[PDB]
Amino acid sequence: ALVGRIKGVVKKTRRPEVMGGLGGFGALCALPQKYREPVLVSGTDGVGTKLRLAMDLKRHDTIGIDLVAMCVNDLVVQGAEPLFFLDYYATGKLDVDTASAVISGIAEGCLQSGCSLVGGETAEMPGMYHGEDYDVAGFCVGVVEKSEIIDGSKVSDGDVLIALGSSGPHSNGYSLVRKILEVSGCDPQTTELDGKPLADHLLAPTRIYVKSVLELIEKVDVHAIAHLTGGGFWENIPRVLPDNTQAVIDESSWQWPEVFNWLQTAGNVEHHEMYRTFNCGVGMIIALPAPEVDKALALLNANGENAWKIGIIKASDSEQRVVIE
Amino acid sequence: ALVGRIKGVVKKTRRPEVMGGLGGFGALCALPQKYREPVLVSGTDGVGTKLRLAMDLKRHDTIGIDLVAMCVNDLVVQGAEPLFFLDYYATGKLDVDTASAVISGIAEGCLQSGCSLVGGETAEMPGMYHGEDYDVAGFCVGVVEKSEIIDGSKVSDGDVLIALGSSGPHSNGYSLVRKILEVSGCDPQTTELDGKPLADHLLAPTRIYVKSVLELIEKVDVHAIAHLTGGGFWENIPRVLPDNTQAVIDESSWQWPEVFNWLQTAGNVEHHEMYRTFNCGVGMIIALPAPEVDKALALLNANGENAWKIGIIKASDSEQRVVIE
Numbered sequence: 324a325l326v327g328r329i330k331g332v333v334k335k336t337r338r339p340e341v342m343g344g345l346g347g348f349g350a351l352c353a354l355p356q357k358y359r360e361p362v363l364v365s366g367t368d369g370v371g372t373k374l375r376l377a378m379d380l381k382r383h384d385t386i387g388i389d390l391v392a393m394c395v396n397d398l399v400v401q402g403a404e405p406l407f408f409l410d411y412y413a414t415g416k417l418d419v420d421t422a423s424a425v426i427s428g429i430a431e432g433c434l435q436s437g438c439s440l441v442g443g444e445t446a447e448m449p450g451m452y453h454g455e456d457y458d459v460a461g462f463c464v465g466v467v468e469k470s471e472i473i474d475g476s477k478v479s480d481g482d483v484l485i486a487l488g489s490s491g492p493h494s495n496g497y498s499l500v501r502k503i504l505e506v507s508g509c510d511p512q513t514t515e516l517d518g519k520p521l522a523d524h525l526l527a528p529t530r531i532y533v534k535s536v537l538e539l540i541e542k543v544d545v546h547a548i549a550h551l552t553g554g555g556f557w558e559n560i561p562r563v564l565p566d567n568t569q570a571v572i573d574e575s576s577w578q579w580p581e582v583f584n585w586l587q588t589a590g591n592v593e594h595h596e597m598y599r600t601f602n603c604g605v606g607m608i609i610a611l612p613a614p615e616v617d618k619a620l621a622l623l624n625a626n627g628e629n630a631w632k633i634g635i636i637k638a639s640d641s642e643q644r645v646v647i648e
Numbered sequence: 649a650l651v652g653r654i655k656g657v658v659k660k661t662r663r664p665e666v667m668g669g670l671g672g673f674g675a676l677c678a679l680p681q682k683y684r685e686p687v688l689v690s691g692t693d694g695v696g697t698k699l700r701l702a703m704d705l706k707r708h709d710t711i712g713i714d715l716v717a718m719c720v721n722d723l724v725v726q727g728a729e730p731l732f733f734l735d736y737y738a739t740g741k742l743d744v745d746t747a748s749a750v751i752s753g754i755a756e757g758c759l760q761s762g763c764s765l766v767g768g769e770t771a772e773m774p775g776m777y778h779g780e781d782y783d784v785a786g787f788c789v790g791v792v793e794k795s796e797i798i799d800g801s802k803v804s805d806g807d808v809l810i811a812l813g814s815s816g817p818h819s820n821g822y823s824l825v826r827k828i829l830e831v832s833g834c835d836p837q838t839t840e841l842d843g844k845p846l847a848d849h850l851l852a853p854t855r856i857y858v859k860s861v862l863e864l865i866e867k868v869d870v871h872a873i874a875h876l877t878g879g880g881f882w883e884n885i886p887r888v889l890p891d892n893t894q895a896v897i898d899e900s901s902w903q904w905p906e907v908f909n910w911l912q913t914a915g916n917v918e919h920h921e922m923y924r925t926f927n928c929g930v931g932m933i934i935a936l937p938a939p940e941v942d943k944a945l946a947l948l949n950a951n952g953e954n955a956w957k958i959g960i961i962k963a964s965d966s967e968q969r970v971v972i973e
Contacts, residue, residue: 335946434950542663621660625759
């Protein structure tokens with residue numbers, strides 16, 4: 324049934340090291356040959372309330388990309404190469420059209436990451452799920468060379484922070500995006516922003532930074548990388564900060580994409596909250612030595628990325644680990 | 649003279665393999681650590697009559713991309729990873745402003761392909777170059793693993809052909825272009841075509857398919873690749889074909905970007921000549937087994953490329969190696 328319409332999208336995602344999948348409960352996959360001492364990096368996550376917006380706008384074609392990007396961008400932060408993906412789709416009444424669009428979006432995300440969709444599962448539970456509601460869980464396994472693991476121990480006083488632009492709100496803080504639409508009485512599809520509906524900017528699929536980061540890591544000495552998700556700047560930057568260091572972000576270095584401006588105005592959101600809930604145009608923050616900055620910026624900006632020097636890291640025993648000046 | 653004007657755009661393209669400094673008489677570059685039995689692949693090329701068109705419109709900041717792309721696209725055909733680039737800029741009276749623009753375009757291309765601009769040479773020839781005229785020669789050195797070289801012997805019968813869309817005319821067939829512009833008396837800047845000036849369609853920089861192809865090779869079994877340069881389909885496809893083979897191009901699989909249509913109508917160019925002088929929308933053609941076609945097309949279209957099944961290869965002792973029906 325559903326397996327019939329997704330056999331293709333899943334097979335065109337297969338890698339040379341894949342041996343099995345979708346036949347039983349145990350996908351087979353050999354380790355990439357380049358690794359001498361391979362270490363498996365893994366993580367799991369979901370799309371969040373963005374799923375509930377997708378339902379509202381009746382568009383499930385890009386939600387699968389947000390799913391993969393939330394797992395894959397957290398793996399590359401340690402220099403891991405996304406090997407394979409798996410998904411647990413949960414629903415009450417299985418809508419084939421809907422579930423095929425989501426798996427289709429997951430295939431797209433996997434094709435961009437270089438990893439493959441080797442398996443998954445569709446669980447029907449009429450009792451726990453009302454209406455067309457569904458929840459998708461993502462799983463991803465990546466491989467990294469033991470001696471190449473980025474642990475952030477090299478980060479120190481003097482490091483410059485480089486930022487990679489986002490495609491929009493990505494996949495976090497959509498509880499507040501909904502709350503704002505509700506209190507503002509705004510219809511996403513009717514209101515237009517920059518010659519395109521507000522619904523397009525909000526539903527815009529998360530940016531996958533995998534190939535650009537795997538390339539950057541090899542050509543430049545990277546000390547740490549931080550994926551901005553839940554908690555925004557305030558939560559995700561200290562995760563890569565060593566003891567006695569403060570991250571000073573330069574707010575003038577960039578211009579917030581119109582969606583965040585719209586979300587701040589319509590919601591009358593405060594400075595701190597905006598940097599907590601939304602990525603404000605910054606999806607990934609990289610720390611590297613000062614001499615490596617010019618090479619890093621030129622590499623990224625010449626290969627489909629919007630990169631800029633967003634700040635620096637200084638020695639400080641302040642408890643306020645991040646400062647947006 | 650202009651060494652201080654471009655010292656920044658050169659240093660920024662530097663790879664970890666590059667040893668040394670200023671690059672004054674003898675560039676140093678170690679081999680990438682991943683190669684077990686490395687083989688050097690080299691090539692040289694110029695921009696062509698497009699230089700004259702870049703002069704008429706006074707646009708030189710992009711001619712450097714067409715220079716690097718010509719050398720760099722030819723290297724990846726055999727699975728070579730672009731390592732370093734060098735250029736030879738010849739002029740009568742060195743215009744520091746025009747020379748930097750061109751060298752900024754070369755650095756842009758080196759960044760996209762992943763190679764370092766490690767050397768250069770600006771020769772002022774007093775009585776050979778008239779006006780602002782200049783000539784640039786490109787030089788690239790790639791490295792491929794001996795056990796992974798793509799020669800084309802594997803190209804068998806039944807093989808499918810994948811085409812990678814071009815950004816326009818690229819960097820070949822511009823003598824005819826200037827003849828057609830001359831004959832029709834049309835000014836490329838005032839003439840509109842699908843939204844943008846005809847000059848924008850013509851001065852479009854060549855697409856650099858390095859990253860894409862290098863990624864395709866690692867995940868898919870590629871038999872051969874042909875870069876459509878001088879000679880177009882008729883000269884470049886046969887260079888990768890073994891004996892007893894014929895490439896059958898399916899003209900319905902794609903439509904020529906509007907530029908080529910305009911050129912054919914304006915010069916009353918015949919079918920065969922168009923395919924000889926111009927790429928007609930196809931920068932590269934790839935031969936691989938039919939089973940690898942779905943993964944290739946998905947991979948390529950998921951990463952910046954506009955790929956499609958353009959035709960097949962059949963066993964045939966015909967002297968007409970390429971057939972376009």
